[PDB]
Design an enzyme around this catalytic site. Structure first.
Site, PDB file in Angstrom:
ATOM      1  N   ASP A 147      -5.610   9.041  -0.639  1.00 42.98           N
ATOM      2  CA  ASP A 147      -5.278   7.986   0.402  1.00 42.98           C
ATOM      3  C   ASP A 147      -4.131   8.206   1.217  1.00 42.98           C
ATOM      4  O   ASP A 147      -3.061   9.079   0.509  1.00 42.98           O
ATOM      5  CB  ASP A 147      -4.967   6.660  -0.310  1.00 42.98           C
ATOM      6  CG  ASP A 147      -5.951   6.267  -1.040  1.00 42.98           C
ATOM      7  OD1 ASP A 147      -7.215   6.036  -0.695  1.00 42.98           O
ATOM      8  OD2 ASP A 147      -5.730   6.020  -2.289  1.00 42.98           O
ATOM      9  N   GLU A 177       0.824  -1.173  -0.147  1.00 39.94           N
ATOM     10  CA  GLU A 177      -0.009  -0.022   0.062  1.00 39.94           C
ATOM     11  C   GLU A 177       0.813   1.179  -0.003  1.00 39.94           C
ATOM     12  O   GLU A 177       0.632   2.238  -0.816  1.00 39.94           O
ATOM     13  CB  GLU A 177      -0.931   0.141   1.155  1.00 39.94           C
ATOM     14  CG  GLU A 177      -2.057  -0.928   1.129  1.00 39.94           C
ATOM     15  CD  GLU A 177      -3.173  -0.426   0.111  1.00 39.94           C
ATOM     16  OE1 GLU A 177      -3.069   0.717  -0.136  1.00 39.94           O
ATOM     17  OE2 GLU A 177      -3.848  -1.389  -0.375  1.00 39.94           O
ATOM     18  N   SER A 217     -10.883  12.148  -3.952  1.00 41.75           N
ATOM     19  CA  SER A 217     -10.434  11.707  -2.571  1.00 41.75           C
ATOM     20  C   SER A 217      -9.053  11.282  -2.612  1.00 41.75           C
ATOM     21  O   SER A 217      -8.338  11.363  -3.847  1.00 41.75           O
ATOM     22  CB  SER A 217     -11.258  10.375  -2.093  1.00 41.75           C
ATOM     23  OG  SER A 217     -10.874   9.100  -2.627  1.00 41.75           O
ATOM     24  N   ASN A 238      -8.531   6.065   2.974  1.00 42.93           N
ATOM     25  CA  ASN A 238      -9.491   7.058   2.223  1.00 42.93           C
ATOM     26  C   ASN A 238      -9.894   8.076   2.780  1.00 42.93           C
ATOM     27  O   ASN A 238     -10.721   7.952   3.631  1.00 42.93           O
ATOM     28  CB  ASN A 238     -10.128   6.049   1.130  1.00 42.93           C
ATOM     29  CG  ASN A 238     -10.753   7.148   0.075  1.00 42.93           C
ATOM     30  OD1 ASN A 238     -11.766   7.453  -0.021  1.00 42.93           O
ATOM     31  ND2 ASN A 238      -9.929   7.297  -0.973  1.00 42.93           N
ATOM     32  N   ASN A 297      -7.056   9.997  -5.847  1.00 39.28           N
ATOM     33  CA  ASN A 297      -8.133   9.480  -6.648  1.00 39.28           C
ATOM     34  C   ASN A 297      -8.868  10.216  -7.756  1.00 39.28           C
ATOM     35  O   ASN A 297      -9.103  11.459  -7.542  1.00 39.28           O
ATOM     36  CB  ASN A 297      -9.140   8.832  -5.568  1.00 39.28           C
ATOM     37  CG  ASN A 297      -8.110   7.633  -5.103  1.00 39.28           C
ATOM     38  OD1 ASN A 297      -7.634   6.678  -5.434  1.00 39.28           O
ATOM     39  ND2 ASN A 297      -7.967   7.683  -3.683  1.00 39.28           N
ATOM     40  N   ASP A 332     -12.009  10.001  -7.846  1.00 35.80           N
ATOM     41  CA  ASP A 332     -13.252  11.079  -7.364  1.00 35.80           C
ATOM     42  C   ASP A 332     -12.824  12.089  -6.445  1.00 35.80           C
ATOM     43  O   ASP A 332     -13.811  12.415  -5.666  1.00 35.80           O
ATOM     44  CB  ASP A 332     -14.104   9.823  -6.621  1.00 35.80           C
ATOM     45  CG  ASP A 332     -13.226   9.269  -5.418  1.00 35.80           C
ATOM     46  OD1 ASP A 332     -12.041   9.569  -5.004  1.00 35.80           O
ATOM     47  OD2 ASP A 332     -13.886   8.107  -4.488  1.00 35.80           O
TER      48      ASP A 332
END
Ligand SMILES: [Cl-]
Length: 129
Positions: free
Chosen positions: A52, A35, A50, A59, A46, A48
């Protein structure tokens, strides 16, 4: 900071992650490797809107609030900034909530695609835990 494998394994065990909700320690160490490559400062944007955050790539749409993500639910009730600390407590506490919500570790795609199905205990082999 960037954790070493056994160093992270030890910190996670101390934080009660070993076998938490049915997931042995190796799963958590494997997830963190793929990750964030063990880096507490990793961030990923991301489509959308968002992002991480941290070693476990939590998120901003559902878990932490970063103030720039539309439709943010802040279910862990913490600013995303707190998840970029060298200390993994906040990330672990949020991770525990994520796995309890009823879908286990599937929240983490790197774990889902690169850890699940393999011998994850190999990730803690050689460590003093
Ligand atoms: Cl933030």
């Amino acid at each position: 900071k960037v954790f070493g494998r056994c160093e992270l394994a030890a910190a996670m065990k101390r934080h009660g992650l070993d076998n938490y909700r049915g997931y042995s320690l190796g799963n958590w160490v494997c997830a963190a490797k793929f990750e964030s490559n063990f880096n507490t400062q990793a961030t990923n944007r991301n489509t959308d809107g968002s992002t991480d955050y941290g070693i476990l790539q939590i998120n901003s749409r559902w878990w932490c609030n970063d103030g720039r993500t539309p439709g943010s639910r802040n279910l862990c009730n913490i600013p995303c900034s707190a998840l970029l600390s060298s200390d993994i407590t906040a990330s672990v506490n949020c991770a525990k909530k994520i796995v309890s919500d009823g879908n286990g570790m599937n929240a983490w795609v790197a774990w889902r695609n690169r850890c699940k199905g393999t011998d994850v205990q190999a990730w803690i082999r050689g460590c003093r835990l």
